Each structure stands twice: as structure tokens, then as C-alpha cells.
Amino acid sequence: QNTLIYVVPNGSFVGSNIKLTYTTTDYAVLHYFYSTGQYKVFKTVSVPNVT
Amino acid sequence: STLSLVAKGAGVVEFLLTAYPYTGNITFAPPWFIAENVVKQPFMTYSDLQFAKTNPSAILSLSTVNITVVGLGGKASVYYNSTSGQTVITNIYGQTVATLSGNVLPTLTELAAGNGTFTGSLQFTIVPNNTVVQIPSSLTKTSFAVYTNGSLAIVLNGKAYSLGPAGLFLLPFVTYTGSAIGANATAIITVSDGVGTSTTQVPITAENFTPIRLAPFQVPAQVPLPNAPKLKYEYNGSIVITPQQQVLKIYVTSILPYPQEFQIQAFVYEASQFNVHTGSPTAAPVYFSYSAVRAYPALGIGTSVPNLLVYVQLQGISNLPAGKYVIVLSAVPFAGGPVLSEYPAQLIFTNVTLTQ
Amino acid sequence: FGVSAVQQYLGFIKSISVTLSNGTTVVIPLTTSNMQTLFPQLVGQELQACN
Numbered sequence: 001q002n003t004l005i006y007v008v009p010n011g012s013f014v015g016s017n018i019k020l021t022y023t024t025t026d027y028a029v030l031h032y033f034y035s036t037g038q039y040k041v042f043k044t045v046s047v048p049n050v051t
Numbered sequence: 052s053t054l055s056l057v058a059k060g061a062g063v064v065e066f067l068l069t070a071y072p073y074t075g076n077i078t079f080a081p082p083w084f085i086a087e088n089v090v091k092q093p094f095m096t097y098s099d100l101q102f103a104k105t106n107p108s109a110i111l112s113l114s115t116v117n118i119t120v121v122g123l124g125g126k127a128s129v130y131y132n133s134t135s136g137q138t139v140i141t142n143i144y145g146q147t148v149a150t151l152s153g154n155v156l157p158t159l160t161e162l163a164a165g166n167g168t169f170t171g172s173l174q175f176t177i178v179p180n181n182t183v184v185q186i187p188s189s190l191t192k193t194s195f196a197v198y199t200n201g202s203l204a205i206v207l208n209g210k211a212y213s214l215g216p217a218g219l220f221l222l223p224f225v226t227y228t229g230s231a232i233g234a235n236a237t238a239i240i241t242v243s244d245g246v247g248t249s250t251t252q253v254p255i256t257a258e259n260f261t262p263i264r265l266a267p268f269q270v271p272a273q274v275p276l277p278n279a280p281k282l283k284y285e286y287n288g289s290i291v292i293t294p295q296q297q298v299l300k301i302y303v304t305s306i307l308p309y310p311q312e313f314q315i316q317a318f319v320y321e322a323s324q325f326n327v328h329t330g331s332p333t334a335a336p337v338y339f340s341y342s343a344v345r346a347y348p349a350l351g352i353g354t355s356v357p358n359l360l361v362y363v364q365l366q367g368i369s370n371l372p373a374g375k376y377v378i379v380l381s382a383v384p385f386a387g388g389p390v391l392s393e394y395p396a397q398l399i400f401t402n403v404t405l406t407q
Numbered sequence: 408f409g410v411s412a413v414q415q416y417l418g419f420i421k422s423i424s425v426t427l428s429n430g431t432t433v434v435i436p437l438t439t440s441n442m443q444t445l446f447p448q449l450v451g452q453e454l455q456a457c458n
Contacts, residue, residue: 003408005408007410009415010415010416010417011416013415013417036102037109037110038109041164042110042164043164044163270430271428271429271430271431271432272430273430273431273432274430274432
């Protein structure tokens with residue numbers, strides 16, 4: 001119900017990442033914060049460069 | 052309300068940039084090296100004060116208001132002075148040489164929200180300038196008036212802007228009497244003969260930038276030396292010159308093509324007259340000699356080994372009495388002096404033991 | 408979550424070089440037959456879980 005799964009081939013494993021973009025489910029929030037740039041929020045999860 | 056301003060990252064300034072020659076062939080990169088004391092993190096201003104006042108933990112644009120390139124003797128700057136809203140460019144001498152309307156510097160855009168990495172574009176080029184260096188005929192039999200490297204120029208929006216002499220900024224350089232000569236040089240050869248005086252000109256291109264390494268025979272020559280200063284390498288290994296030897300076998304390593312001829316000059320100082328601790332001569336050389344090295348391939352022509360075995364000859368080794376000495380080998384170029392000498396520029400044997 | 412895993416071509420032994428230095432970093436000319444037959448093992452199992 002709450003799980004997201006990203007699968008990449010062998011060649012795309014290095015730095016395989018997911019970017020989450022959350023948008024308001026509200027018209028007023030889209031309208032009133034278009035200028036400030038805080039009506040949609042994005043973040044990323046990536047495979048760490050590990051030793 | 053003024054609140055926490057937290058900077059979890061800034062711009063990154065590195066070395067070994069992709070070289071762009073002044074010639075039309077820009078896709079060739081001679082090894083460039085921004086000189087000492089340029090350590091990342093430029094100063095730049097946020098594009099929005101109000102958001103940064105609370106927390107700049109999101110996607111932002113950073114207007115660069117400080118770019119510093121430090122050379123050996125000075126440093127040039129390109130900074131967007133927001134007080135006047137003008138891009139001010141100063142050369143290595145520390146004097147304002149350019150003022151440009153608006154922000155011609157690109158605005159470093161963050162790659163991610165609350166990350167700290169800001170990316171833009173920085174181009175560079177070389178604009179030749181004038182600086183006369185005189186090589187006397189007392190050591191080469193032919194005088195050389197050399198116009199030096201030129202001037203390093205930052206290229207913004209496709210337009211170049213000089214930042215002072217590139218000889219101090221860029222590596223390699225060739226030091227003659229403390230004067231640095233690099234690519235885009237111009238050597239006027241003054242030949243003196245029985246007829247009189249003649250003058251010819253050989254221009255050094257931006258593709259004749261050519262690092263050249265001088266190495267001892269017992270030290271690897273196919274492996275670049277990272278432990279060699281820009282001006283010299285002091286080999287502390289013990290060397291004893293037999294009386295049957297009048298030539299010293301050394302290696303000359305070339306990373307870029309080297310078509311023009313030169314010579315290796317050997318300056319012999321007494322061990323007491325040379326300060327091995329600092330590597331600087333405390334007195335005039337007690338002897339001088341030269342060996343003309345005509346740049347020719349050893350193996351296959353053109354595709355020979357990047358290492359040349361040079362027999363540095365001496366115009367009389369019996370002139371120096373047996374004892375302890377320091378011998379400095381320096382590359383002095385002939386007939387259109389090309390660019391050479393990084394890591395090392397000179398080869399200083401500090402423990403020469405001449406025995407006869 | 409309901410999907411089995413398959414082969415991932417996720418690397419290869421870079422080389423087997425030997426130093427022999429009178430000035431010579433001896434980069435070995437890599438031969439395919441020798442290299443495959445020096446590491447022919449089909450199953451190199453790991454030891455610890457989640458590592």
C-alpha cells in the first residue's frame with residue numbers, strides 16, 4: 001500500500017535514483033505560492049557512492 | 052525577522068582545467084595548472100534574501116561575486132560588485148582593468164534543493180602580451196629577446212577579458228634570470244658573427260606549450276615526478292663522478308611534441324657555496340658548461356620514445372678540482388625558445404663528488 | 408514484493424598487472440583466455456547477510 005520499488009539494469013545501478021515531487025491537492029496553494037517556489041516540493045534518493 | 056542563515060555548500064573551484072589555446076584549435080588541452088592558494092568556496096550572493104533569512108534549504112540561484120585566480124607573485128579577480136551592480140575584473144597586479152555593466156558572470160544554479168552544489172560555466176584563454184626577456188650571448192653565443200607567455204583571460208559569454216600575465220598563473224613556465232616564459236611566446240634570435248648582427252623572429256604558438264621534464268638516469272622517466280617543485284628538483288642521491296666520465300646521462304621526457312633544438316647548461320657550484328637546504332645558490336657558479344641538444348627522435352621518427360637519453364657534455368671537466376659540488380642542469384633553448392620545464396624546471400644534483 | 412531476480416552484469420576483474428620497475432610500471436597486455444581461466448568460478452557466494 002505504501003511501497004515504491006525502482007529497479008535498474010546492471011549498467012544503471014551506479015547512481016540509480018528516484019525523485020519525489022509532491023504537489024498540493026489544492027487550487028489555492030498552487031495559486032498563492034507560485035512565485036515563492038514552495039507549492040511543489042522535490043527530493044531525491046540515490047545509491048550512495050560507497051567504498 | 053532575521054533568522055538562521057545556514058550554508059551547507061558553496062561553489063567549487065578546482066585545478067587542471069580543460070585548456071583552450073588561443074589558436075583556432077581549441078579542442079587541444081596542454082596541461083594547465085592554476086597556481087598555488089586557490090581553495091574552492093567562492094563568495095556569492097543568494098538571489099532571494101527573504102527565503103535565505105529563514106532557511107536556504109531549497110533550490111536557489113547564487114550570483115557569483117568573487118572569482119580568484121592566484122599565481123606566483125600575485126592574484127587576479129573577477130567579482131560582481133553588487134554595491135555598484137557591476138562586474139569588476141582586476142589583473143594579477145591588483146589594479147582594476149575592467150568594469151562591465153550588469154552581471155556578465157553566470158548565476159550558479161543549485162543542482163538540488165538543500166544540497167549545496169551550484170553549477171555554472173567558466174571559460175579561459177590566453178591573450179599574448181609584451182614582456183622583454185634578454186638572454187645574453189655570453190652563455191649562448193646568440194642573444195634572445197623573448198616576449199613572454201602573455202596574459203590569462205577569463206572568457207564570459209564568449210568574450211575574453213585579460214587577468215594579467217599567464218606566466219605566473221599557468222604551469223609550465225621557463226625561468227631565465229627569474230623571468231617566466233610560457234606559450235604564445237615570441238623569440239627574437241640575435242645572431243652575432245663576423246659579418247655583424249642579424250635578427251630573426253620565431254613565434255611560439257599556444258600549442259607549443261609543451262611540458263618538459265629533466266630526470267636522473269637512476270630515477271624513472273616514464274613516470275611523472277609529483278615531488279618536484281615548479282622551479283627545480285634537488286636529487287639528494289649520492290653521485291660520484293669517475294675521471295673516465297665527461298658526459299652525464301640524463302633523461303628528457305616530453306609530454307607534448309618538441310620539434311625545436313635547445314641545450315642543457317651545467318652550472319657547477321661548490322658545496323659550501325650552494326645552500327642545499329633551500330636549493331638557492333648563494334654565490335656565482337664556480338664553473339659553467341653547455342651541451343647542445345638537437346631535438347631528434349631516437350627510434351621511429353615522430354613516434355619515438357617520449358624519453359631522450361641526453362649526454363650532457365662539459366667543456367673541460369679537468370677545470371674543476373676534485374671535491375664536493377652541486378651541479379644544476381637547466382634547459383636553455385636555441386633559435387626560437389620553446390616552452391618547457393614543469394616538475395622539474397632544473398635538475399640540481401646536490402651531492403656531486405668529483406674524483407680524478 | 409513478488410518479482411524474482413535475474414543476472415546483473417555488474418562488474419569484471421579489471422586486470423592482473425605486475426610491477427617490475429627499473430622505471431617500468433609494467434601494464435600487462437591482457438589476454439582473454441588466461442584471464443577467463445584464472446577466474447572461471449561460476450559461483451562466488453558471499454558470507455554475511457545485507458553485506
